[PDB]
Design a protein around this nucleic acid. Structure first.
Lengths: 95, 63, 64
RNA sequence: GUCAACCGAGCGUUGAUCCGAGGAUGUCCGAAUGGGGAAACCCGGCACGAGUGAUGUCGUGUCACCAGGCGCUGAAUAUAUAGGCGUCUGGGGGGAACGCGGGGAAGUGAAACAUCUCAGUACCCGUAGGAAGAGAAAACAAAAUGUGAUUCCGUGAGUAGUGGCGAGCGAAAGCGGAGGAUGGCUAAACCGUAUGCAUGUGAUACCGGGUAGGGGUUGUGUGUGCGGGGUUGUGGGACCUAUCUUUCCGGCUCUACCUGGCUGGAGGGCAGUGAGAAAAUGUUGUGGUUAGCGGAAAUGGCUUGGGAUGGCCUGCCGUAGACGGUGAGAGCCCGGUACGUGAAAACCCGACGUCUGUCUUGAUGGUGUUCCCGAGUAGCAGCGGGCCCGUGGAAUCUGCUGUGAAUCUGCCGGGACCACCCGGUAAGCCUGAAUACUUCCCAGUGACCGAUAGCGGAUUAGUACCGUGAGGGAAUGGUGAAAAGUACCCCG
RNA sequence: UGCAUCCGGUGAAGCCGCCGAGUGAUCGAGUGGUGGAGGGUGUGGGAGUGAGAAUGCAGGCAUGAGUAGCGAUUAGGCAAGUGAGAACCUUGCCCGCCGAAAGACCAAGGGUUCCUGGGCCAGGCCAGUCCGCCCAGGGUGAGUCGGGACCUAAGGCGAGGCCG
RNA sequence: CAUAUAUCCUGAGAGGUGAUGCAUAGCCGAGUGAGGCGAAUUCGGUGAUCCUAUGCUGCCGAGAAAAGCCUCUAGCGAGGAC
């Protein structure tokens, strides 16, 4: 029996200078499952954090290709979701 | 035109010997004739390819 | 974690809830690893194995 | 896990890591199969759930085509069919070699070349199986009072022959062996029964006789289905017809009575997952396979050495002196070896059973007559293929086209053909063993290679690279016993 | 390689020399150095058994030779700075070239070459502190833009089907 | 019944609004580089290969399909429209 939880779509947050700059504007970036869509991510975030989500922005990034002694290797490709919270705006401290 | 729809008679393969004994490949097709038969006494007619041997045997029913 | 012994003693409902809290704990551990403040790396392995165990028990119960 | 460590974290005597067997999960592509598509990525329907103030969204099943059963409907159109609808069961693709059935080259040789060879090879097509094909005489043989299914191996034999009688090609009989199953089942003539189609002296007609009813076990035909009966060459079997006859009980041969044949129930056999019918279900076999465990004897002395596993000298085991490792040649240091042991579970082999069919309403040897013994088949003719046989006097076998028989004093074969003798019984079907092979797994072997060798590939290997593409396709092994891989100083 | 004997960590093979030997292919259980684990002899057995050349193959390296060349038709100079090292890097001031381009933006194509920090064995036809080079991290945000969920052209595939 | 600069459709462009905003020449400091303030904005000429324009005229060589939009009923309908 499959039990679908909203917490498997969201994999991990994104930590970087750009992500922090978005955070000071109440905008958070997550690494989501590559087979998810904007509405699914919005619903999952609303269920997880009990927050009102205004908009979700997605972008696909190709993993970097690295040279090794064995040859060429490619890292995993990932999808990023940039979630903007509503005016209620209680910060996500789990970040 | 070479495979009977009743008994499956197929063409034969052989050689065409000339006066100088030059053997060249050739085929012996069956004498296939298109006959509209009557499968049941109801009267339905269907076009089938039956060899003349099948017609002689009465296996086809051209009623 | 929890060995299958007493895991099989639970009924379907609390098995579902145990799966759910284990998934939430895995979510928290993944976020902590992403930020990088927790030291015990084996916690992720243990939680994943508990989730697999409860899934297997549920499958056995529903199959027979 | 490993290249391949460096950390960081932890598990384990409450049995971890690891090995074997059985399960669960198994994203997307791929026969790919809901639709589409530039393979691994886009879009859906239905049903049931999850979620939302509602749409959006999520999860689980299901939705391709074709073929064959079953059921509903039956167009033009009247009978009806095609077709449509629904529901079940199958198929689809992959694989190194081996099999069978078809299609089928050329370079080459003939010192040219076309008949011929190469060669029914290369390749292509359709199909299986664990093997396949063939297989039970319409056979060989030659007067032997002879063999007796098929297959495979050795001889026969490079022979008889065949061939622009050139290059070349090339049997069979017989004999010796492997394996044995000289095996089984049917179709017909006749009965019984059911049904379809025609009609009906519609009565003196169909049961085995004699008695009595009756106008249909239809009365007659015809076809089909099923059950009996029948499997053969000294011909056999049906139709008859005497003799002898190794269970009991019951229901039927139109009807009841005395008589001969059908059908069920009880013993009694006989067989079986088998070619001879089929699907199952139990118990048991230190029977096997898929993990393992045990397993004798030197810390021996002197000496060289970094190290003894070297040399000399002492013992010990041996059902174990096979082979590797350990700081240099080790039976006694280790892993092991000889030799014994081990299976919870799964699978494979047997055996005994439940179970299934099957014979018992049966069996024997005799006598003279009608019917049957596989049909567009054999035979013949024309054009071809393959047989030693290249059309030749050309037998046997076979493809297409015409023509087209007989049922045993019948038919076929005995290398044109005729007569006599001899052998066999075609136009129906199954059959194990002896035989061929290795993608893969296990255990070994080598007067085989040892890094320009051996697989292309001991190292990133069908990789890098080359080509749009089919495709082509490399190079690179060794420190040391142990990393003890040169702390520290100096020039830079 | 069968068999029989001999040598070897007190140092075998291999390689480099000396001193010699045989009628020849060749030899030295004669020795010196290097080296570190297997060899010799006799008698038989079997060869992937002997190269100087095939415009022979693979690897390594010579002559030409420190020679040609260092890839257009625009052109660089000075001061300062960094740095072990500066004609080529950074800044500043001049000079010059293009300007229907040698300016700006897309499509196809490429795939991280883009930014930050670090580096100067490999590459840049010179050097380099620099780089489209090497290393790590970061970076691509769509209801309206180009496409799909909309439609068809050429054409492709093609249920049934016809033909073979 | 109609020949009307009538009526309607289409339509560059001018004008208003969007715009109390935004931006800018400069002025202050600040010196990687960050910040604040911020004037005037009228009138002419020239002028497109661009727009009206899938327009208009001429010509023969006679110049895609479907979706979309509008309409018509067939048909659904007790609810449905703005």
């Amino acid at each position: 029996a499959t039990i679908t939880d909203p917490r498997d779509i969201i994999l991990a947050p994104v930590i970087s200078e750009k992500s922090y700059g978005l955070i000071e504007d109440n905008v958070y970036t997550f690494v989501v499952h590559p087979d998810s869509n904007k509405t699914q991510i919005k619903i999952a975030i609303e269920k997880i954090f009990d927050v009102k989500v205004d908009s979700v922005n997605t972008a696909n990034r190709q993993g970097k290709r690295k040279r090794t002694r064995t040859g060429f290797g490619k890292r995993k490709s990932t999808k990023r979701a940039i979630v903007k919270l509503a005016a209620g705006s209680k910060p996500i401290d789990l970040f | 035109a070479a495979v009977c729809d009743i008994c499956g008679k197929g063409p034969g393969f052989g050689k065409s010997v000339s006066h100088s004994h030059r053997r060249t490949s050739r085929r012996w097709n069956p004498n296939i004739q298109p006959v509209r038969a009557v499968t049941r006494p109801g009267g339905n007619k269907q076009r089938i390819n039956a060899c003349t041997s099948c017609i002689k045997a009465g296996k086809v029913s051209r009623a | 974690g929890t060995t299958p012994g007493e895991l099989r003693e639970l009924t379907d409902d609390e098995l579902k809830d145990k799966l759910r809290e284990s998934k939430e704990e895995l979510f928290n551990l993944r976020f902590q690893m992403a930020t990088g403040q927790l030291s015990n790396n084996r916690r992720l392995r243990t939680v994943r194995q508990e989730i697999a165990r409860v899934y297997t028990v549920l499958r056995e119960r529903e199959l027979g």
